[PDB]
Each structure stands twice: as structure tokens, then as C-alpha cells.
Amino acid sequence: GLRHTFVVADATLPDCPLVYASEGFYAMTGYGPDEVLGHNCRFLQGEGTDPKEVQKIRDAIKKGEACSVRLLNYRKDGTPFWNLLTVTPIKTPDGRVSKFVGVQVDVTS
Numbered sequence: 001g002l003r004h005t006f007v008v009a010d011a012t013l014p015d016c017p018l019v020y021a022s023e024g025f026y027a028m029t030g031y032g033p034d035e036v037l038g039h040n041c042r043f044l045q046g047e048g049t050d051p052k053e054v055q056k057i058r059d060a061i062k063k064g065e066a067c068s069v070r071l072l073n074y075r076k077d078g079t080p081f082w083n084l085l086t087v088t089p090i091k092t093p094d095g096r097v098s099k100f101v102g103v104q105v106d107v108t109s
């Protein structure tokens with residue numbers, strides 16, 4: 001929907017760590033930059049997170065392809081929320097993946 005957050009991951013590093021996150025991302029998740037920059041976004045996952053959906057994202061990434069999934073995530077305070085995540089690979093002219101961009105939408109309603 002209209003309200004959403006955005007983040008950028010560096011695919012030139014093995015674990016796709018975050019290099020940038022929108023104002024909304026920090027405010028929604030409750031985390032600060034000096035807390036999540038340089039880290040993979042998997043810290044948003046938790047107990048009820050469907051490993052099957054997580055695997056789908058992992059596969060798309062390893063294949064350097066776009067993907068959209070609905071996942072249960074948790075704020076820094078531990079409270080849950082439903083996240084409709086869409087990941088998009090950004091490539092250089094040589095065809096290789098340089099960055100991955102992510103758009104998150106809280107669809108908890």
C-alpha cells in the first residue's frame with residue numbers, strides 16, 4: 001500500500017548487509033541505524049516466521065532474482081507484525097548483482 005519502508009543491501013558482501021534504510025524502516029521496526037547498519041535483515045524474523053517463505057527469499061537472492069513474500073516479523077520490542085516484502089536485485093552493466101533493494105509494507109491492517 002501507500003505507507004511503506006525501504007532498505008538497501010550490499011550484494012558485494014557475502015551476507016547482504018544493510019547499507020541504507022529509510023526513516024520509516026527505523027521508526028517502524030524500532031531499531032536505529034547505529035544498530036542495524038552492516039547487518040543482514042534476518043534480525044526481523046522470529047518464532048512464528050515461516051521458514052518456507054524465508055527459504056524462498058534465500059533462493060531468489062542466490063539466484064539474483066526478484067521475489068515477493070509475506071512474512072511475520074517482530075519489532076525491537078518483540079511485538080509481531082505482518083510484512084509484505086519485495087526484494088529487487090540491482091545490477092551493473094556486466095549483468096552482475098551489486099545491490100538488493102527491499103520494500104516492506106506492514107499489512108497487519
Ligand SMILES: Cc1cc2nc3c(=O)[nH]c(=O)nc-3n(C[C@H](O)[C@H](O)[C@H](O)COP(=O)(O)O)c2cc1C
Pocket residue numbers: 007008009016040041042044045054055057058061071073083085087088100101102103104
Ligand atoms: C534488500 C533486502 C531486504 C530484506 N528485508 C527483509 C525484511 O524486512 N524482513 C525479513 O524477515 N527478511 C528480510 N530479508 C531477508 C533476509 O535478509 C535474508 O535474505 C533471508 O532470511 C535469507 O535466508 P537466511 O536468513 O536463512 O540466510 C531481506 C533481504 C534483502 C536482500
